[PDB]
Amino acid sequence: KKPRQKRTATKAYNVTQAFGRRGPEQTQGNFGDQELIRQGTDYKHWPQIAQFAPSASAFFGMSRIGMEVTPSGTWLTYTGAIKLDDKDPNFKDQVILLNKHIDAYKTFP
Amino acid sequence: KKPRQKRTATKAYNVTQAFGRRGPEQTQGNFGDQELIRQGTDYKHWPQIAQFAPSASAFFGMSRIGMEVTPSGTWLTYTGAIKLDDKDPNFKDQVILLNKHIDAYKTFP
């Protein structure tokens, strides 16, 4: 189907199916509690997470972009940081929501 | 206008105006030669670059997401990698196009 970076997780094709298991390794995603993992973009608070994701123009404009070649193939690398607005009246709710998903897999039964 | 991560660069609002000057530091973008800097999404080969940009779902599914509280504010950190298809006949040209823009800023004021 679609290249991995263009996939959209849903209830029918979830975060694990599209992007693999959450874990600690540099190759793994770490974001998502059990609800977000099974629902993807169907998750009730998805829009509040998607407001932090970069447009294509911002992805290539804000990030440090590189190319790394490994035994698995050729990779476009990306790093960066998005500053939350502490004058956003939703700031405190945004922190709480991001805190619920970052490394949430560590607590899974 | 838009938050930084949702901005769209164009000739009318360019990569420097939207995302700041290219540079070597951690929250400095390093991507784009003078033509892409000037034109943003009006760049003639923008679709060949944007094919590698992640969906919101993939950005939060693939990336390693962190939160840092520093003297400057609260930051959402992100790292990851997007696999190129080395079997795509277009692979060689994709690599040339990306490398044209990665760290181009080092060659001009």
Residue numbers in the entry:
A (entry chain AAA), B (entry chain CCC): 256 to 364
From the paper:
The nucleocapsid (N) protein plays critical roles in coronavirus genome transcription and packaging, representing a key target for the development of novel antivirals, and for which structural information on ligand binding is scarce. The NTD is implicated in the binding and melting of regulatory elements required for transcription initiation, whereas the CTD drives protein dimerization and is thought to contribute to the binding of the RNA packaging signal (PS) sequence during virus particle assembly.
Each protomer in the structures is comprised of five α-helices, two 310 (η) helices and two antiparallel β-strands. The CTD dimer is stabilized by extensive hydrogen bonds connecting the β2 strands (Leu331–Ile337) and the interaction of residues from the loop between α-helices 1–2 (Arg277, Gly278, Glu280, Gln283 and Asn285). This region—which is flanked by Lys256 and Lys257 from both protomers in a CTD dimer and further composed by Lys259, Lys261 and Arg262—is thought to contribute to RNA binding. When the apo and complexed structures were superposed, we observed no significant changes in the overall structures, as judged by the Cα RMSD (0.19 Å deviation).
